[PDB]
């Protein structure tokens, strides 16, 4: 499944 090294951390945008 997806990596786990993505950016910009994903919150409640």
Request: no cysteine; aromatic share 38%.
């Amino acid at each position: 499944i997806l990596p786990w090294k993505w950016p910009w951390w994903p919150w409640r945008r």
